[PDB]
Amino acid sequence: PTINQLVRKGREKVRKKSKVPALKGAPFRRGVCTVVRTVTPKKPNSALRKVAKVRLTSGYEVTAYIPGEGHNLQEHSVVLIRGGRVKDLPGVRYHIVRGVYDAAGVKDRKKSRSKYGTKKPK
């Protein structure tokens, strides 16, 4: 573009589209599980992965992932979530924070237990 065109029209600042819409500014957000079930992932994977349809404090409902091996989550379980998606499960754009509210830590876990909300063992 000519310098003149730049004086006229200018350069256009790119904008950032948050990948974590439901969070409404905040770092984490509180909620309750309405549905708790398993969803099979997209190619080229096969599994029964753990999810929860969760109702937000912002009166939103998001599909959220349940990390670890096994969980104590059920319908009506109050839960805390955080950002970051799960590539293989579409629509699941957030993660459940284990070891908060009715989300238990992972029983018997010995490695990286901060991520899976397990207290230090014997």
Partner: peptide, 10 residues
């Protein structure tokens, strides 16, 4: 937001 019965409404 109302759930089958929970004192949690959302």
């Amino acid at each position: 937001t109302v759930x089958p019965v929970x004192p949690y409404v959302x």
